[PDB]
Symmetry: C3
């Protein structure tokens, strides 16, 4: 690939050099490797989380009594786990012959934590088997270790899918980069109140913005519009996971 | 481009290998070729199809009497055909010297069909000369042949532009990949009822989401914001095609 | 990168060759160079410009008396200048060792002008030090020179960040390409009236669509969701720049 020409930036004014951490340089290399290998598409969708939200908030006592704080991330992790098992191509990786998929029969999901040193993506194993408060607690531990540079490489390995949530900061949607060799990543932006047509009139519903990026070699456009659709359906009534 | 490191995925749990069809491998190669050659931009827009929809629905008898089902795709195809002739740079391809455009004086448009074996993009020739019921019928034939693997390569050649519609499944918008050597592709997602400001109050209008991806070497940002704008204008009053 | 196979396009109908201007070929080369070097992400956000708009419109007399027309672009330029100084990583470039950032202590911002010959991106120097009417006037001069091919390379050099506005034509959002070696670019699409929830009911607010694309090697997802958030906050009350 042609390089970018160097510019003497100091011809235009004062400059200062600050160096990158090795975490950032590792990070920079991997993103560029994914960017060039994965033909990326993003599928946007909004889920109605009005009821999910009222549930989250009523279980505040139970969570506090268990010592965990129940955020939106365990609810996202449970639902993507159920779906990664209904739609197995999302839980797979392209074999290096490029002529096969390796479908994983396990569901371990990573989630992005932004730390001062750079980006880390701890992994929760067998998300499909843990409960909302187990996932709430584990998520919080991995993120605290991650921030304290006390996370060990063992826990950054073998994920099947990544959730990257910026809802806690803002924005309307974004286009995340697939964390190759995985095949998809969910971005979650900020929920806001919205008018949704009910057949007769517009009702305020709390809408969550989802941005699924996928490896289009492996997932076609209709499989991914169906993944965001099923996820929107599950988050609108999480009891369907019971079925 | 650096390759992705292989991972022994079975260290993390049980895996299973399923092989890709040759259609998928062809598909995978072509997308990656476009991804690396085309600097991609997507321009989003929403068109007001409230009246187009009421027309579609009133011609249900005429269509049924003609044996066709009149969906949204013939109306999209007629309008993009008219526009591919008003704005000729969208109907052209970059010559291999990279120093010229080859403007096509014909309008043949392809449309994406997702089949079990993989993605196929049959082509309708001289879309600019056929009528809504001729396009309705032909679209349906090509898609049925496509699904039955009875489509022959002759009909997958020489398109000028691609429409990729996921409206029948869901989602809010996506960023399609340009089907090189063409220079643009329209993605169409699901229509939903929306409040649109009329000067005084918000009126529910049925809005169609459009996502135009284009080859920015050949099309600049203002030409493409003008293409989605004209298309939104045409779909809001398709009689302007008569003019 | 594999090339695209040539097609005899004339097998399908009449074709015509029109040649590209050297400006377009320069343009084509640079975009492709950025596309392949920068792992791109776009962060979308909407800012409430209801009050900014009413201010713009009341200073119409002052602007007319000064000979300038006060559009939205000087207000965008002042705010991005303030922010490029609050969040310095956005005002920096990756050193060619790839192991350091060069933080620029100056703020010069470029803005995209689409001319018949192709795209030009004149630069305003020390945007942080000029006023809304100085920026209004200079912006207009550079664009007129740009359209008249009377712009000299001196004024297309050493920008820190780019604004690309298509609001004057239309659309809902787009994904601009980073103008490497800069690290981010703001796309601005068309403002429209929207229902925004106020705690109790929906109020019509004039919303401006922002699309920030960034070089993810250098900027992480949370730094960019925070940039669009602060910008949305500043445009909603531009007096915060006084603070
Ligand atoms: C469990 C976790 C690892 C992740 O938690 P989380 O789901 O991000 O929630 P959080 O950090 O508490 O988020 C902050 C606030 O914004 C809210 N928020 C989260 N997602 C939101 C969304 N998508 N839309 C709107 N608001 C959101 C939270 O619920 C929380 O509200 P309160 O402070 O008023 O209770 C937590 O302990 C943590 O470290 N959080 C820091 C943020 C983070 O890194 N998240 C990574 C997710 S990928
Ligand atoms: C003519 C065609 C080739 C394409 O038809 P189409 O325009 O996609 O319509 P369809 O398949 O009938 O779509 C299914 C339903 O969702 C609707 N739908 C289509 N586009 C929609 C949109 N953009 N927004 C909301 N709903 C939509 C349809 O009108 C239809 O409604 P009913 O079943 O209630 O009449 C058809 O015979 C076919 O094979 N359809 C299968 C889907 C497909 O592959 N489409 C490819 C288009 S690219
Ligand atoms: C100062 C400038 C360089 C840029 O001006 P600008 O901010 O783009 O405004 P403009 O060209 O006057 O825009 C045309 C109209 O659409 C409006 N418009 C601009 N931004 C808009 C937005 N984001 N949303 C909605 N409408 C918008 C303008 O305010 C103006 O309204 P009136 O004509 O009714 O006053 C101007 O002299 C010029 O050359 N404009 C041509 C367009 C252009 O190239 N803009 C480049 C910006 S990057």
């Amino acid at each position: 690939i042609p390089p970018i020409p160097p510019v003497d930036f100091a011809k235009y004014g004062e400059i200062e050099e600050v160096p990158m951490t090795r975490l950032m340089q590792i990070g920079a290399t991997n993103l560029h490797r994914s960017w060039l290998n994965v033909p990326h598409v993003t599928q946007f969708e909004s889920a109605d989380i009005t009821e999910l939200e009222a549930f989250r908030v009523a279980q505040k006592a139970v969570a506090k009594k268990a010592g965990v704080k129940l955020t939106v991330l365990p609810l996202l992790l449970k639902a993507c786990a159920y779906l990664l098992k209904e739609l197995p191509d999302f839980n797979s990786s392209l074999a290096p012959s490029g002529q096969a998929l390796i479908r994983k029969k396990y569901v371990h999901i990573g989630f992005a934590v932004d730390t001062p040193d750079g980006l880390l993506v701890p992994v929760i194993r067998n998300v499909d088997q843990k409960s909302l408060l187990q996932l709430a607690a584990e998520a919080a531990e991995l993120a605290e270790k991650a921030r304290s540079k006390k996370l060990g490489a063992d826990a950054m390995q073998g994920a099947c899918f990544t959730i990257s949530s910026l809802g806690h900061i803002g924005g309307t949607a974004f286009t995340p980069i697939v964390n190759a060799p995985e095949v998809a990543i969910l971005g979650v932006s900020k929920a806001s109140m919205q008018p949704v047509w009910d057949g007769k009139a517009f009702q305020p519903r709390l809408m969550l913005p989802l941005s699924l990026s996928y490896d289009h070699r492996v997932i076609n456009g209709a499989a991914a519009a169906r993944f965001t659709k099923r996820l929107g359906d599950l988050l609108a009534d999480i009891r369907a996971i019971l079925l």
